């Protein structure tokens, strides 16, 4: 019952490649990612207003 005592927290958000390229140093392994399999239609857990 205390948010401070929590060990972890997980959030899922929508992002595009330009956002990741804004800070090229911070992110790695961008070329291996595939964009078709990870999509809002393919992931049912994510809830969003995007068509």
């Amino acid at each position: 019952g205390d948010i401070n005592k929590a060990m972890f927290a997980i959030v899922s958000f929508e992002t595009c490649k330009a956002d990741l390229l804004k800070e090229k140093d911070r992110y790695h392994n961008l070329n291996k990612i595939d964009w078709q399999s990870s999509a809002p239609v393919n992931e049912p857990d994510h809830a969003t207003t995007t068509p």
């Binding site: 078709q36 239609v41 393919n42």
Partner: peptide, 27 residues
């Protein structure tokens, strides 16, 4: 009455491979 989960099991859209190849010439 029953407790529907309200998730709507749906099937996604099948891929297309020939169409991106083709260039389009306007009429």
């Amino acid at each position: 009455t029953f407790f529907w989960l309200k998730k709507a099991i749906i099937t996604a859209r099948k891929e297309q491979y020939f169409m991106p190849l083709a260039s389009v010439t306007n009429m």
